Write a protein that binds this ligand. Structure first.
Ligand SMILES: OC[C@H]1O[C@H](O)[C@H](O)[C@@H](O)[C@@H]1O
Ligand SMILES: OC[C@H]1O[C@H](O)[C@H](O)[C@@H](O)[C@@H]1O
Ligand SMILES: OC[C@H]1O[C@H](O)[C@H](O)[C@@H](O)[C@@H]1O
Ligand SMILES: OC[C@H]1O[C@H](O)[C@H](O)[C@@H](O)[C@@H]1O
Ligand SMILES: [Co+2]
Ligand SMILES: [Co+2]
Ligand SMILES: [Co+2]
Ligand SMILES: [Co+2]
Ligand SMILES: [Mg+2]
Ligand SMILES: [Mg+2]
Ligand SMILES: [Mg+2]
Ligand SMILES: [Mg+2]
Lengths: 387, 387, 387, 387
């Protein structure tokens, strides 16, 4: 079973299945993919849609004429398949001009160029139906302490995003921005390194309602953080506009393994959260088929992304629907966590002797939380061993 | 040289020099310190003031009578020395009743107790002259995914902090709150794990102006993050109310080494930022003398904290005052980072052909940033090798 | 199903289920367990045997008289249940005298004491039937660079282990030593931090055949290493004398979660290796029930250790027995890895033009490894989704 | 001051200063360097010598004719400058044929090719005067558990190194091998991931005297290990044949910063060890000038490598020569660490009541180690603040 269909909202970046396998120590192991072929092959696997950087679709430095022919070909393929383009983004990291950043490059003329390059692709993104425009500032940062005044850099970053929002607002576009955090690589430290830092920064923008986050499983895991917890906080703030799904084995370089690889239990708790919170955005895969693979392995790895999501969804639904799990949740007082601590108010709390003067601290301390039995039920459900 | 004086604003927690050296695998190696003796010994070392958890000063479970005698003794010592109490905090982590948290414990009655325990110590803190009240939620979190609904937990955490602000507001107290993040330990994952997550959460509180952060060097380093960058972001947001200074060697358990130990270059860039941003709060040391040490080693380690700050301050001031460093900063275009990207406005940017159509991307890409020469000047200044 | 029986060779340390839950920031949450009660409760869960530190069984500082009464009581419990004692070890880390180490303490008289304390417990271990004597040097190490001359420390460590082997040899005991590595905690860096370092060091001992390793899942994971790979290397060397099973979420403090928690796919590949290599030693659990739990949660967590091993064993056996997996292994050329590279010899290799001069490097480079399809079969088997 | 001269034995890889700055997310920012120009520019900076991969010097796929012209040009440059070639190595990682490894590729014909490619460059290395031949198995490893049988892979790795030693032995070459460990990148996990694992593996080779290690500062730091401790263990074993010097900020991708950047105190303790142990091999820099830099920044970064070594050497010599530091070392009993624990023998130890029965454990436990005062003296010396 576990066959994906378009209703599952699975999307892929052109740059994922199209990764040629060049890494810091090795040349490409696969030939380039025509974006048209990717659209058609992904349609046939059950995907909902594709996403793109400007430079994935239009080779850098293309004339106005060549650009229009690349776009018309791609549009033809989308029209033939019904495939959607829910998200687009800008490549502000590959070309050598961006070696010190785009929006926060020390050189002012690079920052202006970065903004104009971005603005041009927003126009295309909106024409193609994108609802979210992602910004990953992979070159915004430093290898050394004196190279970047971080307060000035944040001024410039706020300036850039404020201008993008003025632009979308002035055009009447119905598109929103999502900032994708990453703690490091390819810069020694990248600005806004986690979901938390990006959420804080959004609250200083002129129009914070236009901006949310695009968290990536493996990126938060490169800081050793709990990805489901961070997604919970982004949901709680109302800012989970988009999400990048993949796998990562711990704190090391950015692996971009297929979703479900890496930390499998984190993947389980992630799917449980997304589904029980009713997240309705794309399930987007930002992953790289390992460079050991040929083109058959590329499509196997892509199918595996969707397969693992669908299996985990099933196990998480079975977990929450199990009356034994519901009983375990009550034994662990998850339901008391949802009750307000003091809806009776501050004065009532202060005058309540049962909350302090007469509180039996030893009796309360003695109560087991019963968390291990609950977690073993979760393990049994994940492994399909409830029998 | 490098003798500290009270004007340097160095402060210490009672629980730092007073750490008896019990760790997860070993019993105490030092006898307990009388808080009065700590105040006097710290005064003689040059400290500005001390800080405390409620339970450092008043043994847990003390009667109203015993509590008043502990406080009067301590007040006597402060009055005799002129030592200040700029910050206080609550112990919501040692007693077994807090094993699932304080403000976000699943059990409602523990959460109510946690709030009443906190409120009582705010009253004492304000009476003693504290300007900042720190909250470190070291038990707020989980070892397993099903144990904590993180959205409900954030509701309860917001509820608790909103009530604390209502309380200080209703009493007319002039005291502000600072949330201290930590990514893990003693819980498997702790809620609000970084400076970023804490900053974001503050923006959802009813009265965000009452709350800032208390970042700790070693805690952000337990997520492998760049501590100066995070402090820069907290300054940029106006939320650096307090700071914990210490050392940490990488991603492992929380070491709480004396300041300057651990990542020495990060300490250098930290001091350079605090001094050039004009941070005027306490330089507070949250550190543990290693349990190898006797009481002479405790006071040597404490003196070393202040000594290393003063040496680094001197090297950072010499760095910024060096005309060769100023020249290097200009060669790296740090001054162009402070110029607005587009103060001419969005329409002018769109109509500027030099920012895109006629932008010579190859010429710009060819410009070296000269960052290594600048960083070697910083190294030479840190090592006192400018000769 | 998945009921453990004594034939499964599951063992537990007295100090695991008996952990009272004192951590660096909190007091005990559970009362102490009588070792007799642990033996009986573990027998009833299906365990094969127990292990112990000297100080778990005999309170430190006991008289010759009290010691004999503690041991006779324990022996009575083993005799009543048929429970075995396959392994024992020394506590050279809790008492303050060991704060700078046991075998590599700077003070010579502590090192002599450490050896005499160890030798006394070897006698007891052998009397009780232990086949392996584990050494975990948790205090051997340093927080600072100048505190320990590491070459001299390794001399002292070799000296200590050489003396232990002379002792067992002179007594004619049939017991072997296993060194348990850990990279850090409670010391800033611990000597012999990984399986690799311990294996190398053994080769410099006078009688290397008496010494192997006791690797712990979570310890190698605290260095971000691949635990199955390290176990493979220890097997390849013939030195896997014992093993500690538990779980760990990444690079942070030592969590000692129940086995199967933490990195679940690593647990799967671990069980697959142990079973396909025919490891016949104890499956020993060195874990801590979280301090959130009461005594019912202690025994639930312990049962969960054995349960997860048995489930993973089943999934790994099904994986290897699947003809589709066998086909996938051949497509990935795992069988060609077992063929010698050049059993024809060096001169034949040098004269073979097909290995260099006429080797079609492009054809070989083009071959996909088909690793993702193989790994998705492994995922399907782990999740019980082969249907 | 701190001017390097050839007597300082500083060496550089052609691939360091010649790094064009292509990273996983960006194209080259610098033009290629002619190896002849590197030799001459490095001679003028004070370098002792250069090192090379085969493919740095001879473009891959060169004819016998083109190869001889590349080598003669390079030889001319060495002869003109007196520059030495103390070490050489093989590129078994860039070409797509090595995507699953060289010596441990699943495909047998790739392994044979890998050996023939290596053997050809040993001949050249010896002709040019190299004393050490380094092997870095950067593609030996896996992204997934089923892809590599690690025991079979270690068989193949031992087979390959045994054949290389037979070859050098049969030719009568006076050259030795050094294995360079790395824990991960570009493979998900690399075989022999640390200095420890490499040392253990050497002891299973047919002729272990021909093999040692080439540890790299940043590589051991990618596992969060203490690099000086690991070097101490390699010295203690007699296996430090070569060393790679650079910098790394923690557990993340391999940064290859200039030496002295990254963990500065670790660099200090490293230089103190190398100099006090009398290491007499090359001080080799395996580093990458950041891709932000132009060619002036390349040579500034290279000079900085040597500069920082010379400054740290001076500070470490001043540290050890300080009578106050000698006094501190005695107070911390570093001199008692060098005394044998029991040169009186096992029977004398067993019969010594002062080592156990009459050992005053409380008196010994009470002794402070005085480590913090010693470490603050080390800090003062590193920072040039002894005044
Ligand atoms: O933002 C779009 C994408 O850009 C790059 O490919 C990044 O590596 C990826 O993290 C991000 O999702
Ligand atoms: O908040 C006050 C202090 O509480 C605890 O001692 C924490 O370990 C420390 O991180 C914090 O600063
Ligand atoms: O060696 C016996 C045991 O000693 C301690 O309890 C260690 O924490 C554990 O790692 C080890 O297995
Ligand atoms: O072995 C020679 C060198 O090969 C590669 O360039 C590696 O990245 C470097 O780590 C190693 O020293
Ligand atoms: Co990624
Ligand atoms: Co801390
Ligand atoms: Co452990
Ligand atoms: Co490197
Ligand atoms: Mg992404
Ligand atoms: Mg703190
Ligand atoms: Mg263990
Ligand atoms: Mg190297």
């Amino acid at each position: 079973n576990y066959q994906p269909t378009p209703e599952d909202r699975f999307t892929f970046g052109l740059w994922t299945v199209g990764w040629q396998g060049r890494d810091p120590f090795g040349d490409a192991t696969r030939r380039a993919l025509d974006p048209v072929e990717s659209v058609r092959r992904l349609a046939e696997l059950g995907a909902h849609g594709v996403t793109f950087h400007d430079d994935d679709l239009i080779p850098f430095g293309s004339s106005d004429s060549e650009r229009e022919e690349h776009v018309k070909r791609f549009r033809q393929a989308l029209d033939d398949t019904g495939m959607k383009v829910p998200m687009a983004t800008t490549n502000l990291f590959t070309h050598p001009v961006f070696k010190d950043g785009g929006f926060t490059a020390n050189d002012r003329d690079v920052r202006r160029y970065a903004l104009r390059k971005t603005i041009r692709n927003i126009d295309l993104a909106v024409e193609l139906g994108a609802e979210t425009y992602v910004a990953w500032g992979g070159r915004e940062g430093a290898e050394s302490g004196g190279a970047k005044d971080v307060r000035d850099a944040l001024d410039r970053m706020k300036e850039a995003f404020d201008l993008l929002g003025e632009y979308v607002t002035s055009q009447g576009y119905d598109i929103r921005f999502a900032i994708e955090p990453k703690p490091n690589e390819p810069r020694g430290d990248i600005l806004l390194p986690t979901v938390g830092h990006a959420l804080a920064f959004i609250e200083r923008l002129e129009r914070p309602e236009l901006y949310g986050v695009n968290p990536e499983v493996g990126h938060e895991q490169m800081a050793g953080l709990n990805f489901p917890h961070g997604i919970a906080q982004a949901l709680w703030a109302g800012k989970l506009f988009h999400i990048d799904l993949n796998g990562q084995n711990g704190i090391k370089y950015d692996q971009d393994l297929r979703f479900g690889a890496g930390d499998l239990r984190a993947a389980f708790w992630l799917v449980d959260l997304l589904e029980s919170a009713g997240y309705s955005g794309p399930r987007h895969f930002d992953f790289k088929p390992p460079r050991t693979e040929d083109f058959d392995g590329v499509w196997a790895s892509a199918a595996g992304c969707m397969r693992n999501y669908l299996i985990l969804k099933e196990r998480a639904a079975a977990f929450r629907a199990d009356p034994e799990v519901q009983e375990a949740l009550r034994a662990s007082r998850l339901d008391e966590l949802a009750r307000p601590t003091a809806a009776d108010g501050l004065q009532a709390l202060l005058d309540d002797r049962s909350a302090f003067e007469e509180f039996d601290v030893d009796a309360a301390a003695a109560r087991g939380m019963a968390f291990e039995r609950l977690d073993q039920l979760a393990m049994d459900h994940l492994l399909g061993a409830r029998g």
